[PDB]
Write a protein that binds this ligand. Structure first.
Ligand code: G61
Ligand code: CL
Ligand code: CL
Ligand code: CL
Ligand code: NA
Lengths: 99, 99
């Protein structure tokens, strides 16, 4: 698809068998989703945003569908109001920015 | 241009007579620039994201050239860790996400 930016670029994702809404975010290096349970072991990670740094849980090799495209990769879980799809998975679905 | 997302989508901007590097950020509602002086009136605003909220100054009707494309809109100035071009200006240069 071709998505304009007059509104937030929200799409549906499916993770752990659940539908959720998430933001396609070219300014996020990594994908960060709201607290939920995921399978397997996690590793610690620090990420920095507009207000400072926080601790999140890093889960590798997680299956996630994004706007109907299958991806498998790293998902960080932490306290956020929004699910954010960052560049590590935008590249797996072939997304580019165009103007 | 078509910008892939293997790396951060960084571009040159010109604002307030200054050349800067900034991140094209579809996840940002607003454009936020590191501390600098801008002409005109401003009012305080709080903006939040990973890590919490920061206080910024909101300047309206500011012109920015983004990778060679002129746009006008509101610009927030504050202690952001990176210059961010958000959707309020991305729309003006006709930027889209495609996959
Ligand atoms: C390394 O991987 C990542 C690191 C940091 C982020 S991020 O979310 O901090 N961010 C990186 C940017 C800021 C350099 C992605 C942004 O696009 C962010 C994504 C984004 C979109 C929508 C809501 C929130 C958000 C997150 C919160 O987490 C606690 C709290 C919150 O409260 C309002 C808002 C975050 N939006 C944003 O910061 O917008 C403003 C600059 C205008 C504030 C994402 C992945
Ligand atoms: Cl200055
Ligand atoms: Cl604006
Ligand atoms: Cl348009
Ligand atoms: Na003004």
């Amino acid at each position: 698809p071709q998505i304009t930016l007059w509104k937030r670029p929200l799409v549906t994702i499916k993770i752990g068998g659940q539908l959720k809404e998430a933001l396609l975010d070219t300014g996020a290096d990594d994908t960060v989703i709201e607290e939920m349970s995921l399978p397997g072991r996690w590793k610690p990670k620090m990420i920095g945003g507009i207000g400072g740094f926080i601790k999140v849980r890093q889960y590798d090799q997680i299956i996630i569908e994004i706007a109907g495209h299958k991806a498998i990769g790293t998902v960080l879980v932490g306290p956020t109001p929004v699910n954010i799809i960052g560049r590590n998975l935008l590249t797996q679905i072939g997304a580019t920015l165009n103007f």
